[PDB]
Design a protein around this motif. Structure first.
Motif, PDB file in Angstrom:
ATOM      1  N   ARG A 160      53.092 137.812 118.613  1.00 24.67           N
ATOM      2  CA  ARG A 160      52.576 136.453 118.565  1.00 24.67           C
ATOM      3  C   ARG A 160      51.764 136.276 117.307  1.00 24.67           C
ATOM      4  O   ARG A 160      51.136 137.216 116.831  1.00 24.67           O
ATOM      5  N   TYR A 197      46.401 149.267 116.779  1.00 24.99           N
ATOM      6  CA  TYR A 197      46.810 148.387 115.696  1.00 24.99           C
ATOM      7  C   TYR A 197      46.413 148.997 114.375  1.00 24.99           C
ATOM      8  O   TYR A 197      45.222 149.115 114.083  1.00 24.99           O
ATOM      9  N   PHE A 223      60.752 131.214 125.365  1.00 19.52           N
ATOM     10  CA  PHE A 223      59.485 131.911 125.259  1.00 19.52           C
ATOM     11  C   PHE A 223      59.443 133.043 126.267  1.00 19.52           C
ATOM     12  O   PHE A 223      60.063 132.972 127.322  1.00 19.52           O
ATOM     13  N   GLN A 232      50.427 122.379 127.740  1.00 17.96           N
ATOM     14  CA  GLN A 232      49.455 122.724 126.715  1.00 17.96           C
ATOM     15  C   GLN A 232      50.212 123.079 125.454  1.00 17.96           C
ATOM     16  O   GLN A 232      50.023 124.153 124.886  1.00 17.96           O
ATOM     17  N   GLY A 233      51.089 122.179 125.029  1.00 22.85           N
ATOM     18  CA  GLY A 233      52.024 122.468 123.972  1.00 22.85           C
ATOM     19  C   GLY A 233      53.430 122.133 124.400  1.00 22.85           C
ATOM     20  O   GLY A 233      53.767 120.960 124.565  1.00 22.85           O
ATOM     21  N   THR A 234      54.264 123.147 124.576  1.00 29.16           N
ATOM     22  CA  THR A 234      55.660 122.929 124.907  1.00 29.16           C
ATOM     23  C   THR A 234      55.817 122.836 126.419  1.00 29.16           C
ATOM     24  O   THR A 234      54.843 122.717 127.162  1.00 29.16           O
ATOM     25  N   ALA A 239      41.098 138.188 125.791  1.00 31.81           N
ATOM     26  CA  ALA A 239      41.102 138.597 124.405  1.00 31.81           C
ATOM     27  C   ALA A 239      42.086 137.808 123.568  1.00 31.81           C
ATOM     28  O   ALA A 239      42.107 137.987 122.354  1.00 31.81           O
ATOM     29  N   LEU A 240      42.904 136.961 124.187  1.00 30.48           N
ATOM     30  CA  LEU A 240      43.734 136.006 123.480  1.00 30.48           C
ATOM     31  C   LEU A 240      42.993 134.727 123.139  1.00 30.48           C
ATOM     32  O   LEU A 240      43.446 133.992 122.270  1.00 30.48           O
ATOM     33  N   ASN A 241      41.906 134.427 123.836  1.00 34.09           N
ATOM     34  CA  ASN A 241      41.012 133.303 123.581  1.00 34.09           C
ATOM     35  C   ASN A 241      41.683 131.951 123.697  1.00 34.09           C
ATOM     36  O   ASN A 241      41.150 130.963 123.216  1.00 34.09           O
ATOM     37  N   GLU A 242      42.814 131.843 124.364  1.00 38.07           N
ATOM     38  CA  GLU A 242      43.485 130.549 124.442  1.00 38.07           C
ATOM     39  C   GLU A 242      43.007 129.776 125.663  1.00 38.07           C
ATOM     40  O   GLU A 242      42.293 128.784 125.532  1.00 38.07           O
ATOM     41  N   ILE A 300      46.752 140.305 119.173  1.00 31.27           N
ATOM     42  CA  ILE A 300      45.530 139.951 119.876  1.00 31.27           C
ATOM     43  C   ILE A 300      44.464 139.603 118.855  1.00 31.27           C
ATOM     44  O   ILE A 300      44.411 140.199 117.780  1.00 31.27           O
ATOM     45  N   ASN A 301      43.597 138.639 119.183  1.00 30.76           N
ATOM     46  CA  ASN A 301      42.776 138.018 118.147  1.00 30.76           C
ATOM     47  C   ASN A 301      41.688 138.933 117.619  1.00 30.76           C
ATOM     48  O   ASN A 301      41.144 138.675 116.545  1.00 30.76           O
ATOM     49  N   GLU A 327      53.223 131.183 120.909  1.00 32.44           N
ATOM     50  CA  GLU A 327      53.700 131.335 122.271  1.00 32.44           C
ATOM     51  C   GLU A 327      53.660 130.021 123.031  1.00 32.44           C
ATOM     52  O   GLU A 327      53.824 130.014 124.251  1.00 32.44           O
ATOM     53  N   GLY A 328      53.457 128.918 122.336  1.00 28.51           N
ATOM     54  CA  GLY A 328      53.430 127.611 122.922  1.00 28.51           C
ATOM     55  C   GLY A 328      52.066 126.984 122.961  1.00 28.51           C
ATOM     56  O   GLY A 328      51.977 125.760 122.981  1.00 28.51           O
ATOM     57  N   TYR A 329      51.003 127.775 122.962  1.00 26.96           N
ATOM     58  CA  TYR A 329      49.677 127.220 123.178  1.00 26.96           C
ATOM     59  C   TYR A 329      49.231 126.451 121.958  1.00 26.96           C
ATOM     60  O   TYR A 329      49.098 127.022 120.882  1.00 26.96           O
ATOM     61  N   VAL A 330      49.005 125.157 122.123  1.00 29.92           N
ATOM     62  CA  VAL A 330      48.396 124.319 121.107  1.00 29.92           C
ATOM     63  C   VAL A 330      47.114 123.772 121.696  1.00 29.92           C
ATOM     64  O   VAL A 330      47.142 123.157 122.764  1.00 29.92           O
ATOM     65  N   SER A 331      46.003 123.973 121.001  1.00 25.51           N
ATOM     66  CA  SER A 331      44.706 123.588 121.532  1.00 25.51           C
ATOM     67  C   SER A 331      44.569 122.085 121.635  1.00 25.51           C
ATOM     68  O   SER A 331      45.298 121.330 121.006  1.00 25.51           O
ATOM     69  N   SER A 332      43.604 121.650 122.441  1.00 28.62           N
ATOM     70  CA  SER A 332      43.415 120.223 122.666  1.00 28.62           C
ATOM     71  C   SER A 332      42.883 119.519 121.434  1.00 28.62           C
ATOM     72  O   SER A 332      43.072 118.309 121.293  1.00 28.62           O
ATOM     73  N   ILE A 339      38.267 131.546 118.313  1.00 26.43           N
ATOM     74  CA  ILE A 339      38.987 130.837 119.367  1.00 26.43           C
ATOM     75  C   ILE A 339      40.337 130.382 118.852  1.00 26.43           C
ATOM     76  O   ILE A 339      40.422 129.763 117.795  1.00 26.43           O
ATOM     77  N   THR A 340      41.394 130.693 119.587  1.00 25.47           N
ATOM     78  CA  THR A 340      42.739 130.390 119.130  1.00 25.47           C
ATOM     79  C   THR A 340      42.967 128.893 119.184  1.00 25.47           C
ATOM     80  O   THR A 340      42.674 128.259 120.194  1.00 25.47           O
ATOM     81  N   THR A 359      56.638 124.887 129.611  1.00 21.15           N
ATOM     82  CA  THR A 359      56.651 126.275 130.030  1.00 21.15           C
ATOM     83  C   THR A 359      56.603 126.317 131.548  1.00 21.15           C
ATOM     84  O   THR A 359      56.212 125.347 132.194  1.00 21.15           O
TER      85      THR A 359
END
Lengths: 218, 513, 61, 128, 225, 229, 221
Positions: free
Chosen positions: B34, F229, E102, E163-165, A117-120, B96-97, B53-58, B47-48, E167
């Protein structure tokens, strides 16, 4: 000034060629004067290359016997015998294959349910539990494409707490995209050990391995 | 309604960059959870694309970052090196998305003599030519619907859509509507092309709380600085419900909350609205036209408001009532994070533009005709202060504003009304003494006030201080005694009750030696 | 000068007890400070031009 | 439509709307949208993560429309503070997003037993 | 002749109260009477350590500075300078906290369905993934009682592919007997980290997690005040 | 001739904090030498002066001890020790704060449907049930404008037949216009009784928050959830 | 020493076959041989009573008149007369039937939903509003058995604040068990007046009455 007859790796014992035994001699003082002798002369191409990678003011000589996997899986005791000029008794040490070999038990665990559900990305886990020699090789596959070793993280092979015998464990994690999972690709862990017939156990998971509400209103 | 807020509509061209600011309530949950920037693709599934939280998409690798400002109460996403596939619909948010707490951004990049002017201003159009055209017809033509139709032709003939507007090298055209954005061609037998692009100015984003205050600083040009400015709101269609106007209008719902401040040496003024409700969130266009209304051709300036209902401003009594002869003790709030400031109190007078001149401030200046009947306590501290005003008549009925001299805007209003009755504390009118010999004053008080703490204070210009004073408990009576009356024991005295910190009714008597 | 240096103060207080919700200088404090800075001369001709024209913008409004 | 209830312990969100009828004389519509969220993984005692996993979910309208905050009201001269509730001190099906929920477990650190406090909903349990 | 600065261990910061920094001086084959200098002189005097012979001699004095729970947390830079006779220039080092920090993601993963269809010993997994300073603690709970550390296995904290920083991730494995898993009690993973609010977070798995719900809606009409 | 010491009223004791105790002596034949000592005399005074609001062959002498609500609400006995020149043995009538209390259960009841169909005036009912002392105040409000006492009816606080402890109940009726209801004006009923901690209880009703005619429940099953939420 | 004359009891007039016009005194201490006389004497005599002393004497000699229900409805005026020796002059009392009656609008009212979530008892309200003479009856039936008078509570008949003609009101209340409500048998409030041809208004209620609301449950996953 110690001597170690380090065994071959597990990589070339399953796939590649140069299954070289590494008789390393670390901690001798002056410059040189080594002499390395082995028992199965079956392609004896003596290389030394004494480097500076020795951590002190006493060098190493990393002797190599090349091309031996056919004598290795049999079990003849390879004996390295080093003559160094600071004594006259040679540094003699032997090693062979291991006696008890239990086989791995691969478990490819799914993504945890809150990651979707975070979709990452999603997190596949591959536990490999209970092998009696220490060495193992984990690979990952998408479809039938082998994924390169910087896309997955693989911890070491540590001893697990057992009241049986000396058994070990390995975990490898693969974080893959959310849309590649949600569409329904198949992802496969492949754990390779020297105690298997086909030398590669393989497990595979996809998205497909019941709410039933009853509203009792008023 | 999700309490997140940011740009409804972003535009760029290829190769450019954007920075998208999304605003959230700054509670201690929102500032540690987040923050995401997802993309609302079809069939379902945002889609994120980057996260906190650090995640950067490709897709966004090496060309975006999300940086979070908790003290401001917002976060911002910088996206570099755009392209035509970066269009579409996106969401910013917290958590959460799939569970709300998000704002739907719609980011549409586009493909890249360009006269870019703002709305309502004037344009110079430089039309050079070939010098075999010395005395010919130095004109413009417009291509309306791709057809050359006349505009202004060298002799004063101007088409009557543009009358009183355009004049004649280079030409200059005033008062640009949105029907002046075509493809002009100057012509003296040769033709020159230049395209006008009148720009709607972008809204600023005002993110206010509920029951808070909003300051609109409307810095138009100093060349429009003599014209009667206004503050429209934008309806769902096309019109204007003008809130304030410099020509003596004020919206009938904004009675007591509005304030148009006087201008500057270069036109830039400000409007201050307080007590924001849920229907105040909208689009506010401040402009300048002599009609006092948004006609066409006026240089607007727009803000986009969001009244956050997750408001930190406490629900206070917005009407206080006191009898004709009595007292009121209003409580004015301020921000707990700034205690030491000067703290004001207004009486909102309309009738010029909406001014608000000070009655009392905290550093000890009370107005001239409110001597002995006004005081500004700093009680109770940590986010409130009392303002006591007694000896009320029906000339005190109106709206009063609880300002501060702080960088935060909790500038609340409160209306005092005068109802029929009689006060509780009953003191004589204006007693007198004789020098040397004593003076005793009685102050009755009813049964309701029999658990409260009583006092008598001598009113200075810098506030009371409670004094000797006896308190008889059987007979309901608290009594002053000025034993040997001197010259420096004169002026007002106040006999009121209190409860630790929360002061109550007070009544006034003046002593004359 | 002493009549002018107290005309900045008689103004700056009145732009403080009459417009408490403000950040700019409402043109009378800016007239009164320029008539202090003269006691240069052409830099104060604008402020008397602005005010008088804004008072000629009061004869109709 | 107006919002009657915003319970955050049962996650019920009753909203309502009088859809009038200018063509019907006395046949109007009074809607009552209810919007339960069923947490489906929460425990029974939500503050104690040893408890069995909850499977029954009982939503009484009177136990979630309740207003347990006191009010102030005006009677003909004065202000009195009333308690407009009739039922207050519930059990909770969902955590509250804005509330800190904690669990105290006995970890050891060698020669002791330090009762440490852990965070059951972090990003809401931060001190100042 | 080198100097290293060791940050305090994590189970001192989180569980206990005090946490001493360590200054280590490895290469010293001399000098039973040298001195260290710790620049945060907040009263509590720093403590020199033993001779402590390392490999081939090298009496390694170390300096344990106590009380570093207030400056180290708020972010004050610690500095250790060390004099020794082999060079007049004294060897120095510095440290502080990390500022990125983090939060970890704890996941507790139930056994596969081909280990519990043996009734021998099932295997549960605990994945603490994606935190920026590389220090964690992973502890286990049977219901509410902490198992000893010699029952489970935890791998070292390892750095992820980017995938970024930057971790990190750590996993752990608990083999619980199958009659505990079938009879229906809960096992919990408990991850301690600096970036966490109250220094510990906790996930819990049991047999039923990993469905016949009976939502009953009494009084859907009726008065709602 | 019997001596009877009554109670403070509740419109005084709640809205006004006065505890005037009203000791009466009824049945006196001719005389006028009545004395009213009070053993908790904390300096206060008395009243006398017998009129004929009796509806009997003889008339009563009153004595009202002023006070405020802080002695009475803490538990304090008041003893109208009264002497009178007929008999040399004087009479006594005592009181204290009536303990073992139960708070009301206020309930507000909407219009019936036959009035909303006949479409003239609708009737809202307020029932305060189960409180232990007899005395109770029912006020009504419209929004927050407190309605005047001459628009609604309020019955006496009778005793209800229950099986356990003896408890009481009171009702009230407000007839409002039908478009006032159907538009959605919020009517409130306030029951103030001294067993309640804050001494007043409100209830508030309108057309939205009572008896709909179209419900639609949505039951969002959410698997990995649990935060609202 | 006044003369009071009573109307017949409403319960005595609805179900029964007798209706007594009764003349009582309050405060004489004499007249052990003084009778009463009424111009409505249709052959049937007046049944005298005992003198029935109040406190310190104050006798109340009751002259009761039975049977007379039928002249009361059609509008005959009754005049009681007593010639007692406290003072020689005899005293009279004149009374008829007030004709401008109004009918009781009876509204039964369900329990509040705050009360049948607790499942201990529920509380049923019966409001009888808008009738011009002040005497009335309320009866409570479960299904069709009458409940006894110690199970329900009936308030008095108060005067109602009304814009036109003065009206009255009475509410009553019955607390029954929650399992008796949920299993669903009816209850009824039966209000009796004299403005009725049927002599008893009756309103019914049960668990399923009152144009029930349409419900539209839906499950979202």
């Amino acid at each position: 000034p110690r001597l170690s007859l380090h065994r071959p790796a597990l990589e070339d014992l399953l796939l590649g060629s140069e299954a070289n035994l590494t008789c390393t001699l670390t901690g001798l003082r002056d410059a040189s004067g080594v002499t390395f002798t082995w028992t199965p002369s079956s392609g004896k191409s003596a290389v030394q290359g004494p480097p500076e990678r020795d951590l002190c003011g006493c060098y190493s000589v990393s002797s190599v016997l090349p091309g031996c996997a056919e004598p290795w899986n049999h079990g003849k005791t390879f004996t390295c015998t080093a003559a160094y000029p600071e004594s006259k008794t040679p540094l003699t040490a032997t090693l062979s294959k291991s006696g008890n070999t239990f086989r791995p038990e691969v478990h490819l665990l799914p993504p945890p349910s809150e990651e979707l559900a975070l979709n990452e990305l999603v997190t596949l886990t591959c536990l490999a539990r209970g092998f009696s020699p220490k060495d193992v090789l984990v690979r990952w596959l998408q479809g039938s494409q082998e994924l390169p070793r910087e896309k997955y993280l693989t911890w070491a092979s540590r001893q697990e707490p057992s009241q049986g015998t000396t058994t070990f464990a390995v975990t490898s994690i693969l974080r893959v995209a959310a849309e590649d999972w949600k569409k329904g690709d198949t992802f496969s862990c492949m754990v390779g050990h020297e105690a298997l017939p086909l030398a590669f156990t393989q497990k595979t998971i996809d998205r497909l391995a019941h709410v039933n509400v009853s509203v009792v209103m008023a | 309604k999700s309490p997140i807020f940011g740009p409804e509509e972003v535009n760029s061209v290829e190769g450019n960059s954007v920075s998208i600011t999304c605003y959230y309530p700054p509670t201690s949950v929102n500032r540690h959870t987040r923050k995401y920037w997802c993309r609302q693709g079809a069939r379902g599934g945002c889609i994120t694309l980057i996260s906190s939280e650090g995640y950067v998409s490709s897709k966004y690798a090496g060309r975006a970052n999300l940086t979070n400002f908790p003290e401001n109460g917002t976060f911002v996403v910088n996206i570099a090196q755009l392209s035509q596939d970066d269009s579409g619909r996106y969401k910013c948010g917290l958590g959460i998305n799939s569970r709300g707490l998000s704002f739907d951004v719609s980011l549409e990049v586009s493909q890249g003599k360009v006269y870019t002017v703002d709305l309502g201003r004037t344009v110079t159009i430089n039309c050079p030519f070939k010098t075999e055209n010395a005395q010919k017809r130095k004109s413009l033509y417009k291509q309306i619907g791709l057809y050359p139709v006349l505009v202004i032709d060298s002799s004063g003939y101007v088409n009557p859509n543009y009358t009183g507007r355009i004049r004649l090298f280079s030409v200059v055209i005033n008062q640009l509507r949105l029907s002046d954005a075509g493809q002009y061609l100057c012509q003296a037998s040769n033709k020159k092309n230049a395209d006008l692009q009148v720009l709607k100015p972008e809204p600023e984003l005002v993110y206010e709380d509920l029951r808070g205050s909003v300051t609109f600083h409307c810095a138009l040009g100093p060349e429009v600085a003599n014209v009667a400015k206004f503050l429209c709101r934008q309806s769902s269609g096309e019109n204007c419900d003008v809130v304030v106007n410099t020509l003596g209008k004020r919206a009938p719902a904004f009675e007591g909350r509005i304030l148009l401040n006087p201008q500057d040496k270069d036109g830039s003024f400000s409007v201050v609205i307080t007590g924001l409700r849920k229907e105040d969130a909208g689009r506010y266009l401040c402009g300048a036209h002599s009609d006092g209304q948004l006609q066409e051709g006026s240089p607007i300036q727009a803000w986009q408001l969001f009244v956050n209902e997750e408001s930190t401003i406490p629900r206070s009594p917005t009407v206080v009532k006191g009898v004709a002869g009595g007292s009121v003790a209003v409580l004015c709030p301020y921000n707990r994070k700034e205690s030491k400031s000067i703290k004001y109190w207004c009486l909102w007078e309309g009738a010029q533009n909406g001014r608000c001149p000070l009655l009392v401030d905290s550093e000890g200046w009370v107005k001239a005709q409110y001597e002995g009947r006004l005081s500004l306590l700093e009680e109770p501290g940590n986010g409130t202060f009392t303002v006591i005003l007694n000896q009320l008549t029906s000339r005190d009925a109106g709206f009063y504003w609880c300002l501060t001299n702080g960088d935060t805007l909790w500038r609340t209003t409160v209306e005092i009304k005068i109802i029929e009755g009689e006060p509780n504390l009953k003191v004589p009118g204006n007693v007198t003494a004789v020098l040397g010999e004593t003076l005793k004053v009685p102050c009755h008080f009813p049964c309701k006030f029999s658990s409260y703490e009583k006092y008598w204070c001598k009113w200075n210009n810098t506030g009371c201080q409670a004094l000797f004073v006896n308190c008889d408990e059987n007979s309901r009576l608290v009594s002053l005694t000025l034993n040997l009356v001197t010259r420096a024991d004169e002026g007002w005295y106040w006999c009121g009750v209190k409860q630790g910190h929360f002061y109550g009714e007070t009544a006034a008597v003046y002593v004359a030696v | 000068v002493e009549e002018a240096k107290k005309k900045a103060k008689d103004q700056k207080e009145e732009d403080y007890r009459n417009y408490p919700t403000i950040t700019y200088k409402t043109l009378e404090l800016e007239i009164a400070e320029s008539d202090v800075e003269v006691k240069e001369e052409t830099e104060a001709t604008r402020l008397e031009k602005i005010k008088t024209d804004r008072k000629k913008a009061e004869e109709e409004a | 439509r107006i919002v009657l209830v915003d319970n955050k312990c049962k996650c019920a969100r009753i909203t309502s709307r009088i859809i009038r009828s200018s063509e019907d004389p006395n046949e109007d519509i009074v809607e009552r949208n209810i919007r339960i969220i069923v947490p489906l993984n929460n425990r029974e005692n939500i503050s104690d993560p040893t408890s069995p996993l909850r499977t029954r979910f009982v939503y009484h309208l009177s136990d979630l429309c309740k207003k347990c905050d006191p009010t102030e009201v005006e009677l003909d001269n004065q202000i009195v503070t009333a308690t407009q509730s009739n039922i207050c001190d519930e059990t909770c099906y969902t955590y509250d997003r804005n509330k800190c929920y904690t669990a105290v477990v006995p970890l050891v650190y060698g020669g002791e037993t330090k009762m440490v406090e852990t965070a059951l909903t972090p990003d809401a349990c931060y001190p100042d």
